[PDB]
């Protein structure tokens, strides 16, 4: 059963940028749609972005549209979240998630199959 591990969190100044990455163990990454979610304490995990297994289709939450970019390197078994123009409202634990569904949309945390352990992202004014 695939293991997912985030890298890249931490403190960053408002207006700055961060690249999160998430690495999958084994040899199944290429068969998953991949997603990123974020957890603010006191709310459900919020959908951030999703990428089909081929990498040909991507989808964003409107709260990050125009600022974040999701991408994948199937040769490295890694999915990425590039975050630009960061705001204090972006502060959260960010989680990667793998979905056995290889196409289409999926924005509910409950409909993903595997999860990483989360990396804290803190944006100060």
């Amino acid at each position: 059963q695939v293991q997912l591990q985030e890298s890249g969190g931490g403190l960053v100044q408002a207006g700055g940028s961060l690249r999160l990455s998430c690495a999958a163990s084994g040899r199944t990454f290429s068969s998953y749609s991949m997603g990123w979610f974020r957890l603010v304490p006191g709310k459900e995990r919020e959908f951030v972005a999703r990428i089909s297994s081929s990498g040909g289709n991507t989808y964003y939450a409107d709260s990050v549209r125009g600022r974040f970019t999701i991408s994948r390197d199937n040769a490295k078994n890694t999915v990425y979240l590039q975050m630009n123009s960061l705001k204090p409202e972006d502060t959260a634990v960010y989680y990667c998630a793998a979905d056995l569904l290889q196409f289409g949309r999926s924005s509910r945390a409950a409909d993903y199959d595997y999860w990483g352990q989360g990396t804290q992202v803190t944006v100060s004014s």
Binding site: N57, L101, G104, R105, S106, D111
Partner: protein, 65 residues
């Protein structure tokens, strides 16, 4: 049928999704039937939301011998 079973079936007929109910995913045991919801008719494949646009129901078949 498990989440894996349902999604792997959708992945197989992904270019055959329509507003018509699929056949049962299995011939024996419990499977799934899928279709594009009528309210979502003509939504292209890559716009279909797993929860909002694809209707799923269980199909019970005779036990596997």
């Amino acid at each position: 049928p498990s989440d894996k079973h349902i999604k792997e079936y959708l992945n197989k007929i992904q270019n055959s999704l329509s507003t018509e109910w699929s056949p049962c995913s299995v011939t024996c045991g419990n499977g799934i039937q899928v279709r594009i919801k009528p309210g979502s008719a003509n939504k292209p494949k890559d716009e279909l939301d797993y929860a909002n646009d694809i209707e799923k129901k269980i199909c019970k078949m005779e036990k596997c011998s």
